[PDB]
Structures are given as C-alpha cells and as structure tokens.
Design a binder for this molecule. Structure first.
Ligand SMILES: NC(=O)C1=CN([C@@H]2O[C@H](COP(=O)(O)OP(=O)(O)OC[C@H]3O[C@@H](n4cnc5c(N)ncnc54)[C@H](OP(=O)(O)O)[C@@H]3O)[C@@H](O)[C@H]2O)C=CC1
Ligand SMILES: NC(=O)C1=CN([C@@H]2O[C@H](COP(=O)(O)OP(=O)(O)OC[C@H]3O[C@@H](n4cnc5c(N)ncnc54)[C@H](OP(=O)(O)O)[C@@H]3O)[C@@H](O)[C@H]2O)C=CC1
Ligand SMILES: [Mn+2]
Ligand SMILES: [Mn+2]
Lengths: 399, 405
C-alpha cells in the first residue's frame, strides 16, 4: 500500500485528496491513510477519522486537543496516536510508515510543514503556494541535502506540466533541481489560465470595476495575480527561465497547461476542471492507477480557445514576472502587498488599478536581503518581510 | 552519432527526413546518412548522394544502374557501394554500420524491406501502411524472435500517440508487443482526423456527391478520395491496434479539422495527454530517429494564441461507412485488412472517374470482404509476400466484378 499523510485534510485540497483516495480504494486497496492534520476543525477531522481510521491524528490548536482525544473514543476498534501542534506535525513527518505527505495547508504553516517533510526525506505532494513563492531557493537547498525527498506539484497547471514530461528523464533529476529543464529537454511552458471574470472588460471599464463584479481567491483570479504566482512557482519547480514561461488564456479549462520541448513538439494534459486527477498523480507518480472518473468527451466539449492576456489590463502579471526576475524575497513582498491590496479592493476602498499600483510601489521600495541559511531563521526572516510588506502597502494606502 | 538509412529517399517522407537531418546537423552533427535507396529516381538520388555522401546507394530498378554509376563518377573522391534490387536492399539491412532505417517506400516493397530490417535487428522508423495492414501478425512474430529490432511509427497520428507515452514505460516493452497497452496504462486512444472534404455534408448531399467535389476542396487524387471516405483513417485504426496493442473497443476516431492536436491517449486514471504542432512531418520523423531522446531544432514554435480555436466532433459511421468496414476487417483479422485495402484501391478509382456513387464505394468493399475466404498464413517472409500479392490481386479483380454488377 501507498502510505499517505494529509496535511490540511478538511480544506479544499485535503477533501479532494480523500475523495480520490476513497474512489481508488473501492477499485483496489492502493492507499493507507496513515495521518490527518488540521488547525481547528475538530468535528470535521473527527468525521474523517471515523471513515479513514488513520494511525495518527494531529491538531495544531492545543485548545481543541483534549476535545479531540475523547471524541475519538466514540469510534470503535480505533486507538490512534493523537498529537498536537508543531511537535506533532514533526512526529508525523518522522514516521517510517509514511511515504507521501499531501500539503494542503494555506499560509506559512504550509511552508513550515513542507520543510520538515523534506528534512525527513518524504515525497511531498505540494499545493501550498507560499512554500515556493517565499522559500523556493531554500527548498532547493533542502532537496539538495535530502536526496530521497521530492516535491511533486499538485496545482492543476503544474501537475499538467509535470504529467507532460517523460518520467525516464524526470527520474534522473527531480523538481526544483538545477538543470531540470535541460535534463527534460524543455524549451518553454504554456501556463494555461481560465482568465477570470474580467477578460472581456475594456481599460475604461476596468478603471471603474468593483469587488461585486468579480473571496480572497476570486479577486486573485480577477487580477490574474494567481497566475503571476504560478509563473514564479513554474520557474522554481521546473528550472525554466521567466522569458520561457508564457501565460495563455484558455477559458474552457480543458487543457491544463502545455510543454514545448527543444524539438518544438508540444505535449499537453487535458481533463475536465477537477482537482482529483492532479492530486492522485502526485500520489501515484511515477505510475498511474485505475479511477472511476467520467472520461473526457472531446467531441462533446466541441471548442477549445486560446488568447494572450493583455498586460495593460492585467498588470499584476507584469509585476509577478518583475518580482520573479528580481529574485530574493521580492516574490514574498509581491504576495504580501497583494494580500493587503486584495482586501482594500474587496472593501471598496481602492479601485482595480490601485491594486497593481500599491503592489508596484512596495516592490520598488524593497532592497534584497542576505538569505538565512537555516529553517528557523528563514521562517522568522520571511514573516518579518511579509509583515513589513503588509505594513508598507497599508502605509501607501493611508497616504 | 545516429547512423541512418533512408529507404525511399526521393519521396515525401524521404525528403522530409533528409531535410530535418540536414537542419539538425547544422546545430550539432548528430546524424550520419549511411545508405539511400530508391526505385528509379537516379537524378534526384545523385543530388542527394552529392550532399550526404552515403556509404551505400541502392536502386531497385537494376536497369538504371549504369546511369547512376556514371553520374556518381562526377563526385570527387567519392566511391560508394552501389547496389541493385532486393539483393541490395538486404545487403544494406545487414550492414552493421546502420542502426536506424526510415522506411518511406510506398506499397509492398515497403513491407518486404521492413521484414528484412527487423530480421537484421534494426530500429525501423515506419511510414509504410501496407506493412502493418497486410502483415501485422507476422511482424509481431518477427519482433519476438529479433529482440533488438523495433518499429517506431512515423505517421503523424501514430507518432503523436507514441510521444504521449511515458518512456519509462515504453522502455519496459516495445511497439507491437502483447501487453504494450497494459504496461503503458493506456485506456483509450483518440485517433485524430482532418475529417476529409466531405465532413460537413448532409446525408442527402452524400448520396449525391461526385469526385469533383472532393478534388475541388482547397484544403486537400487517390489520397484525396481516401481522405473523403475516411478510409485512410480506417487503415490507421488497424495500424493503431497493432502498434499499441489497443483493442478495437478502445480506439475512437475524432474529427479535428485544424490539424494541430495530432492525437491523444486517455490513461487508466482518465487523464488525457495529447501532442500538438503544425501539420509538419518533420517532428514525427525526427522523433523516430532520436527516441527515447529529443534534440534541438529550429522549427517554427507553435503559436497557440494565433491558432486561437481548436475543434472536435464525432464522425457519423452512417456518413462514413468505410470506417465501420475497417473495424470489422481488423476485428476479423487474417488477411481481411489486405482485402479491405485492395478492394478500396479499385472502388476509389471507380469513384474518381465518376463510375459509381459515393455510397457504392463501401458497398463494393463490403462485398469483396464477404466473398473472401480466410487463408492459411505463411510461416516465412518469402511465402507470405507471394501470398499477400496474390490476395491483393484477387481482391482488386473481385472489386472490378462487383462494379460491373
Ligand atoms: N483549493 C485548490 O483547488 C488549490 C489551492 N492551492 C493552495 O493550497 C493551499 C491550501 O488550499 P485549500 O485547501 O484551498 O485551503 P483551505 O482553506 O480550503 O484549507 C486549508 C487547510 O489547512 C489547514 N490549516 C490551516 N492552518 C493550519 C495549521 N496551522 N496547521 C495545520 N493545518 C492548518 C486547515 O485546517 P482547518 O479546517 O482546521 O482550518 C484546512 O484543513 C493554499 O496555499 C492554496 O494557495 C493551490 C492549488 C489549488
Ligand atoms: N507522404 C506522407 O506525408 C506520408 C506517407 N506515409 C506512407 O509512406 C509510404 C510512402 O510515403 P511517400 O513518401 O508519401 O510516398 P512517395 O511516392 O512520395 O515516395 C515513395 C518512395 O519510395 C520509392 N520506391 C518506390 N518503389 C520502390 C522500390 N521498389 N524499392 C525502393 N524504393 C522504392 C520511390 O522511389 P522513386 O523516386 O525512384 O520512385 C520514392 O522514393 C506510403 O506507404 C504511405 O502510406 C505515411 C504517413 C505520411
Ligand atoms: Mn492553479
Ligand atoms: Mn496519417
């Protein structure tokens, strides 16, 4: 059996992961769910524990900890190891009987978890964006030291790229390693985007749009900042130059991304918009297994369309390329300032273009810092810059 | 270096192969063209020999040998081995300085050459349709005996399927092996088709169409009609079945008029992988020679935003019965696909010169198939070739008879 831990099991990624594991396990017993970990959602964790009966349970908040140990007594024939906090997260990461860890934790605990999974030589099915956006350079260092550790991407677009690769080549290297694109003969990447709800809008129309027309995630789809962050993630994951990453708007969301190889042949991965396939592939790689999913009916789909995004209309994309090319903690600053700008737009306090304007001014003010060479100092360093960047964005608004 | 022979070097496949080879060599000297083989195109062969300077030259038609020999004399410091006919073909196949052979010969000499390449443990970059359509079963047997021989498909759709596969799995097996599709986790194949010039016509227009309508179409003589009826795609279904050990149950023809997605593979998890490029035979040929690797080219990059729209529809088996007939013929096996192809050759020509109706094409083919009696399969290459030509000739005659009917 493949022994899997699910970090952030009650969220969107965690829930889809459990959905697809359940489905596959009905066909043949392929997965053992060995561990589940959440922040505060004790009752939802409880119901998952009842179905999946994992050897380990962990909850980040100590207040609901004992509130979890006695709930579990209601489950018959079930005597799990119940753990709490960072210390419990680390105990799960250390377990010899766990092979793969799905990281579906939002924010910086996602990054912290990713670091300890790698340090324990695990396969990490990564969904968390902060991990690579903020510590791409340091994850590369950890992966260099921890030879058997791997990051396998779970986001639909990144999984698509990963699936288009030849595993004969992938097995010679791994994600986030220097020379990855050379070993895999990659020339460029087409990063597909739904385009969000603003694609048809004019500049003058955009000048006056409000949040009602388009919570956090939806606004990032509207501005296409989400795609900008994915560009940065692509660069790290696959060692592809920024100049060789092209964002493409494919509104039907059937083609999930494409890889052009050095001979100019293009390979792409297709399915209905569903997060189950990418998650399953992260857990089965380098193999595939049977599912019961509805087969793609291309004739039924009928029409697939592609256009270039206008950078004037979506300058958040421009800023993400700028921040990636600049490197250092500029992507951390990009993400933090976006968080503030996002919220201000949601509360009708700024206009659409003020979002990119604020982000642009925070980036302009940042200076490159020397990178911390250990996990704990880096976490502090990243949270410091994140906070600074959030503070600066707020300052610019108030001024 | 990759040491290559080009069989049928003066035809479309052969000249595409030399073109991509030349272009790739400019970037990095990767290929050595060791042998060139044609039927009778002596001037064109001489022109190629001047540039590529292969160790071997072969002409099938022994009668133009002196003409070739005298032309070759013009090339300073060049003394190739100049050979003739089957003896020459077999000699090239057995040469140890040739690792890969592009087979771009049309009709049955393509099959004969394919057998001998396999018998000599070569990598065969195969474009010729007759090979698999007429001797798929037998090629399978040869590939089991000659362990280091491989077929790698060169036609655009078959190459696309092949490129969609995970080479970590492909390396565990090879094309035409039993269990190829199980080892590669293949669930279903989307075999893409341009759709032919008749794709948009109603049932009523199809009862009425004539060959001029097909020939008039801007996007596309024999080849054009086979595209119109979709019999070309029917043959490619039979090829697909053998190349990838995919059961007929699991091959779906889909019409994609833009010709950008070249085919797709649905895997057992339902994830779908497709290969995409401009219609250009250079990529499929190159891949057959560089597999399992890829090398740099200077080909025009695919501009997806410029292409803008990609479309798909299901072809109606009522509108294109030739597809239905190809499946039945493949399912039956034996020499039925030889019969399908041969009877089609006549019915095609009949429709071309306005002698029969569109729907008569399939009617004739179906009838020759019904008439055919399963034959005992020859156990060696020579007897089998004789057998195949005999059955081919029979089926052509039978088709002429049902025309008269
Ligand atoms: N949703 C999607 O389809 C995709 C999401 N992403 C990325 O994946 C990450 C998470 O996505 P998503 O699942 O949507 O987010 P959700 O908010 O839906 O889920 C977050 C999960 O993480 C848990 N969590 C939060 N903090 C902690 C912590 N301190 N310790 C342990 N667990 C914690 C939550 O637990 P609790 O229930 O207790 O709050 C919850 O289970 C994000 O970084 C996002 O950008 C990327 C690609 C696709
Ligand atoms: N053209 C294409 O885009 C594709 C073609 N194919 C397949 O490839 C095969 C041929 O392709 P294509 O290049 O188009 O055909 P062509 O007519 O363009 O080329 C045929 C070549 O074969 C040579 N030839 C014919 N008979 C013999 C023989 N007895 N011995 C040695 N050489 C011979 C010809 O030489 P000479 O010049 O002297 O007559 C010529 O070089 C066909 O079976 C077809 O199904 C498959 C996919 C795509
Ligand atoms: Mn995404
Ligand atoms: Mn074809």
């Amino acid at each position: 059996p493949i022994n899997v831990a699910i970090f952030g099991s009650t969220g969107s990624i965690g829930t889809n992961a459990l959905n697809i594991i359940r489905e596959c396990n009905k066909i043949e017993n392929v997965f053992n769910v060995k561990a589940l970990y959440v922040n505060k959602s004790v009752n939802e964790l409880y119901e998952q524990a009842r179905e999946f009966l994992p050897e380990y349970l962990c909850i980040h908040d100590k207040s609901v900890y004992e509130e979890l140990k006695e709930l579990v007594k209601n489950i018959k024939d079930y005597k799990p190891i119940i753990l709490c906090g960072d210390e419990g997260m680390k105990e799960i990461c250390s377990s010899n009987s766990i092979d793969k860890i799905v990281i579906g934790i939002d924010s910086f605990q996602g990054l912290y978890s990713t670091m300890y999974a790698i340090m324990n030589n695990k396969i990490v099915a990564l969904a968390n964006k902060e991990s690579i956006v903020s510590a791409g350079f340091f994850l590369k260092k950890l992966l260099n030291i921890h030879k058997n550790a791997k990051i396998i991407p779970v986001d639909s677009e990144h999984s698509a790229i990963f699936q288009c690769l030849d595993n004969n080549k992938v097995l010679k290297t791994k994600c986030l390693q220097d020379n990855f694109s050379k070993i895999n003969n990659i020339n460029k990447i087409f990063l597909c985007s739904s385009g969000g709800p603003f694609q048809n809008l004019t500049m003058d129309e955009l000048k006056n749009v409000t949040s009602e027309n388009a919570k956090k995630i939806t606004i990032d789809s509207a501005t296409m900042m989400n795609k900008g962050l994915e560009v940065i993630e692509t660069h790290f994951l696959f060692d592809v130059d920024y100049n060789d990453i092209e964002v493409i708007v494919h509104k039907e969301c059937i083609i999930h991304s494409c890889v052009e190889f050095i001979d100019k042949s293009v390979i792409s991965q297709m399915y209905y918009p569903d997060m189950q396939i990418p998650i399953l592939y992260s857990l089965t790689w380098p193999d595939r297994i049977k599912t019961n999913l509805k087969p793609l009916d291309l004739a039924q789909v009928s029409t697939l369309t592609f256009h270039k995004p206008s950078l004037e209309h979506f300058p958040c994309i421009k800023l993400a390329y700028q921040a990636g090319i600049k490197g250092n903690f500029y992507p951390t600053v990009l993400n933090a300032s976006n968080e503030i700008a996002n919220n201000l737009f949601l509360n009708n306090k700024i206009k659409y273009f003020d979002i990119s304007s604020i982000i642009s001014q925070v980036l302009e003010s940042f200076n490159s810092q020397k990178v911390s060479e250990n996990s704990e100092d880096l976490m502090k360093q990243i949270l410091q810059i994140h906070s600074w960047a959030k503070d600066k964005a707020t300052d610019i608004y108030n001024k």
